[PDB]
Amino acid sequence: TSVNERIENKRRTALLGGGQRRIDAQHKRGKLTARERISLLLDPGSFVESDMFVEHRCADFGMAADKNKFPGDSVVTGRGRINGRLVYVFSQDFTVFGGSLSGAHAQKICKIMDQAITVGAPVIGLNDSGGARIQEGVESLAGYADIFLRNVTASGVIPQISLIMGPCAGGAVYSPALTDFTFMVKDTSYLFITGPDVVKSVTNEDVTQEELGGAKTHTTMSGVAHRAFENDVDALCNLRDFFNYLPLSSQDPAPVRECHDPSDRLVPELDTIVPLESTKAYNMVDIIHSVVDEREFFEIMPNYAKNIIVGFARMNGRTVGIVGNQPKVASGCLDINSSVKGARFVRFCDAFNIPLITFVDVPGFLPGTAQEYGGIIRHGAKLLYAFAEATVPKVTVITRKAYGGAYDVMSSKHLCGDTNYAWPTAEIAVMGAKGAVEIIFKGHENVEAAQAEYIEKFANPFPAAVRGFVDDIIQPSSTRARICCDLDVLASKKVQRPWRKHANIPL
Amino acid sequence: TSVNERIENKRRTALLGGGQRRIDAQHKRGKLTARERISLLLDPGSFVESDMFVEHRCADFGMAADKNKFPGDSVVTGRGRINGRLVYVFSQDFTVFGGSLSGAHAQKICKIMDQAITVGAPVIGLNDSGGARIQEGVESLAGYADIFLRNVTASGVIPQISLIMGPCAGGAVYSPALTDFTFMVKDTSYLFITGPDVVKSVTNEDVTQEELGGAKTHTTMSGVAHRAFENDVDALCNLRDFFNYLPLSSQDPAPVRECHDPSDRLVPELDTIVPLESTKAYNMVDIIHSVVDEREFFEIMPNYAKNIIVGFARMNGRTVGIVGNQPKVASGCLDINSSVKGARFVRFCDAFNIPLITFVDVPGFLPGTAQEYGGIIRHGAKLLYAFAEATVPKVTVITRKAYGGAYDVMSSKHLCGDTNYAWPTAEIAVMGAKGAVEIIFKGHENVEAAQAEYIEKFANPFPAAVRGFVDDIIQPSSTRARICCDLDVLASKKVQRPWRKHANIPL
Ligand SMILES: *C(=O)CCCC[C@@H]1SC[C@@H]2NC(=O)N[C@@H]21
Numbered sequence A, B: 001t002s003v004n005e006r007i008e009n010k011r012r013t014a015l016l017g018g019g020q021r022r023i024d025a026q027h028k029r030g031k032l033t034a035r036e037r038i039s040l041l042l043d044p045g046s047f048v049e050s051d052m053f054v055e056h057r058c059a060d061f062g063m064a065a066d067k068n069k070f071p072g073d074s075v076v077t078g079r080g081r082i083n084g085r086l087v088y089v090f091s092q093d094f095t096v097f098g099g100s101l102s103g104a105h106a107q108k109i110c111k112i113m114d115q116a117i118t119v120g121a122p123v124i125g126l127n128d129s130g131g132a133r134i135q136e137g138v139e140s141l142a143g144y145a146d147i148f149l150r151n152v153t154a155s156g157v158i159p160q161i162s163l164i165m166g167p168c169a170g171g172a173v174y175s176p177a178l179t180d181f182t183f184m185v186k187d188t189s190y191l192f193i194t195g196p197d198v199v200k201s202v203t204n205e206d207v208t209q210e211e212l213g214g215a216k217t218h219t220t221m222s223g224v225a226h227r228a229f230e231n232d233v234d235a236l237c238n239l240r241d242f243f244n245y246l247p248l249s250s251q252d253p254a255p256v257r258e259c260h261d262p263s264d265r266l267v268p269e270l271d272t273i274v275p276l277e278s279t280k281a282y283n284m285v286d287i288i289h290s291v292v293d294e295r296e297f298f299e300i301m302p303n304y305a306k307n308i309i310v311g312f313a314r315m316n317g318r319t320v321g322i323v324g325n326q327p328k329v330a331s332g333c334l335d336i337n338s339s340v341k342g343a344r345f346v347r348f349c350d351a352f353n354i355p356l357i358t359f360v361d362v363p364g365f366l367p368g369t370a371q372e373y374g375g376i377i378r379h380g381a382k383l384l385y386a387f388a389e390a391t392v393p394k395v396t397v398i399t400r401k402a403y404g405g406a407y408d409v410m411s412s413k414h415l416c417g418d419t420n421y422a423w424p425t426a427e428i429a430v431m432g433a434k435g436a437v438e439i440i441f442k443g444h445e446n447v448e449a450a451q452a453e454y455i456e457k458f459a460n461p462f463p464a465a466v467r468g469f470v471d472d473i474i475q476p477s478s479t480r481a482r483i484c485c486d487l488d489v490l491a492s493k494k495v496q497r498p499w500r501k502h503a504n505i506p507l
């Protein structure tokens, strides 16, 4: 056998992976293989695979046998482009040793992370594993340590996107916790530290795989996964479109893309969304959809902390992040869960120079022992900090209510905001007229007259505007045009801040 | 066997190394072991050994047998102090696998280099090896690559001192080429890429070990080793004293140490060293010894390029570097070899904030085809650059001759010097009076009168001094006091220079 023949056989084996019968199982299971997934993700013909001939060096427990020598060592790594833009990817291959992490496995992933940091290119990981490769022992633990170090170092330098498309257990579960966004695939992906076998052995509780770490749990109740997609093909199609929003590095401005939607059009549909009756809820999403370019909005965590809306959109071609209250759910009140989702989203957009638009309608905080015992004070400070720290353009629109300390938490002008607009129905106060009059006028005669006088003077947007809290009071139909104008002039804004070794968010 | 018993046996094996019989050979050979050498080098009780329990992971060619498992894997690494000052060291142990370099071998060395860079501590290596460990194959080549990368990265950050105390072959020979100073041990150390067996196989020439790569060759003819010491014990004793001159990092000022030698004393011995007869040589070393604190001078490469003197000394407690000509050898003329030694010494002292004192007495360059064919133009530019680039205090004293372009090469005031003094016998000119008059007065009558007129006006230190080339003309007896005064006021001097990615020395 010649050298060239050996090489050709090594290429064909790396392409097959764990063997055709294991591929057949993956397809029976409704899953794509690691190499098929890359072909869908990246532009045709743009993918360049690295280190395809790397094999493990472990010789213990029979691992020195030729029957265990799978070139590629369970990961596909390399670089490519999505719509002409450079991206680094890796995808874990479940057909070789179960997708378990070896020393060399982690290495290959680390090397492309080092290039991505060096050139300033994003990294997308497609995760699917069973955990560490116990046959090597502590080399897989060193593998995890090296990946974790890169994931932390890359934070704020390049965006890191993780899509989980299968099981995930052991140390693998912490890389999505270090990246910026985590997505899952409904009823196909799992994310858990230990399996149901350990849970039942430790505590006398019964649980199945879908209940312990299923995609529905992590997108609806734990707040870990940002969005689950129906299947592998739809998940990668939406991932490509999501990719188009983000810059390649934090040194880059928010991407600007060709846009046909006139920036100066009016939106008459906004003038009557907000009811005059204070106890009538409305859907904030109708406002978000009508303002954003071509009515396209990418919603993050649609099923978790529904009282606050966060997501991506484009206005006049430029990527922006949108945060707003949802009065339809829990009167639009802040709670622990909403503060966690908000702070994380805001922090990402600030780090990568993506402007923020805030739609405020918040009557206060959710009362009760469930929130007080949960540390609502500690968690609420997370959203206040996330806005106060921001140095990217911030445009706030107040649609109806902003009572109490929630006024400042939801990116008020006094946290170094750029512009703040009020709609005619906006009301800014420490509390509603009923509470304020009962406290201010206590024991006096003709309280009912005092109630009428207070409402006429303070139950509107004027006592705040005349003080400099609001820059203008605008007709809702003009909101989009007003925001577009601010975005196109604040984009070159820089501010100074004292030197710090690093930030100290309340956590 | 309990866990504690196993640990105690692992400690005793690491201390023994390659076994008592191999130690016996080392002592028969007149050599100390790697651990005995550290005890001599570092302050008693200050040494802390790291990673004493590390073993190789190679399982091929029988390397998995328990009989090959030597804890420490042929290197002693760790940290300590010399006179209270932190230093990182490693010493290669020849008794385990011949001192050959394994993957893990290089690792352990790299880890202490990473700490030394992080804290700002010097590194001293004691080298003794036979080359790569061929049983591992390409892992030892990766080992060399990682060491080389650290040695380059540390340059200009911490000083790196290498003492070779045994054979050195293969890739190992390049680490002393990356460090700042290389020392050897006479008739015990060797430094060669390939052995005499390869040389005789390639070319029809006979050579022995001492001729191919002996300490005498590298200190006298190739200019690679800075100084050879008689034996292992004397080599480490002089190394400790050398260590006391250098700062721990380039962020530190030149060390200042208690000194009893008055800074303002006169040195009458200098007034009559330089003869009035222009063709009478004198020994520059008598001037150097009489100026420096307590007449202590550390001479570098005493037997190579004897026409130029470089070394370390202290004036008023502060470490300084001294460069000067030696008129005793080749009239004090510059050549290829002298330019190489000078530029390297000057560059080190500048990088680590050690002031320079220059004693100039140079009639020009060595003529002939031996120098022209050797690239005297290219090599002479090395010393000119090394001085011109310097940003540390530079004090120049001109004792007798400075003709031609050599005037500027030997750190003239026009290369951003701080002070420049002339002795009464100094003469600065493009060329001597005889050549200048024959060229200026060609074909004229009464040339002999023109010769007398030229000598009376130009053959002294005045045509340069009246132009601003010399700051003062001083009596030699006051030289030391004048230099001490300049050093104590230039020490806080900083200059600005345009931004550069990196320097581009002519090479
Ligand atoms: C009736 O008195 C209940 C009042 C709750 C109104 C809302 S709920 C959360 C905010 N906190 C608060 O005190 N008022 C707001």
Ligand SMILES: *C(=O)CCCC[C@@H]1SC[C@@H]2NC(=O)N[C@@H]21
Pocket (backbone or CB within 6 Å): B331, B333, B363, B364, B365, B366, B367
């Ligand atoms: C006799 O004419 C030889 C003159 C050499 C004098 C010295 S040697 C090196 C310098 N170069 C030079 O032209 N003169 C100096």
